[PDB]
């Protein structure tokens, strides 16, 4: 009876293990989606930063 | 009191024989059953953290 009682607990350890890794798995994609979009924004940010300068340098 | 000393002798000798016969068979099955109980205490403790 004690062996039937034990195996049931470790089945729930697995069910929790799978859904825990499954939630983290969805988060990972979101992180990589936006982290790229932030990288896109910063590149464009640095382009203006120097573009606005090189316009003003020539105007003089 | 002497009637009990006969009983204490006769009965406890039977008890020690019954105990040591059981113990030889059941101390092994105790360890089997008791080491299995410790597995619930760890199977539970991990369950909560998960």
- Exposure on the CB side of residue A59, measured as CA atoms within 13 A: 6
Q: Following DSSP, what letter does each residue of A1-60 receive, concatenated?
A: -HHHHHHHHHHHHHHHHHHHHHHHHHHHHHHHHHHHHHHHHHHHHHHHHHHHHHHHHHH-
Interface test with A, best of B41, B46, B49 (most A CBs within 10 A): B46
């008791």: which residue's tokens? Answer: B34
Question: Closest Cα to residue A12, out of B21, B46, B38, B31?
Answer: B46
Please, which residues have CB within 8 angstroms of residue A5's CB and are 6 or more apart in sequence?
B40
How far is CA A7 from each of CA A2, A20, A23, rounded to the nearest angstrom? 9, 20, 25
**Resolution number, Å:** 3.6
**Contact yes or no for B47 and A3 at CB 8 A:** no
Angle, in degrees to the nearest 10, between helices A2-59 and B2-49:
20
Q: Structure solved using which method?
A: cryo-EM
CA atoms within 13 A on the CB side of B7: 4
CA B42/CA B3 separation, integer angstroms: 51
Structure tokens at B29: 């099955």
For residue B31, list chain A residues with Cβ-Cβ distance below 8 A.
none
């Amino acid at each position: 009876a004690l062996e039937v009682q034990l195996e049931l607990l470790e089945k729930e350890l697995v069910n929790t293990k799978k859904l825990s890794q499954g939630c983290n798995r969805k988060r990972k994609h979101y992180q990589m989606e936006v982290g790229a979009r932030l990288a896109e924004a910063e590149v464009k940010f640095g382009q203006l930063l120097q573009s606005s300068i090189q316009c003003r340098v020539a105007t003089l | 009191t002497n009637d009990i000393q006969r009983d204490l002798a006769k009965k406890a000798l039977e008890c020690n024989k019954l105990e040591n016969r059981v113990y030889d068979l059941v101390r092994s099955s105790y360890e089997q059953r008791n080491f299995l109980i410790k597995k619930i205490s760890h199977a539970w403790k991990a369950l909560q953290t998960e």
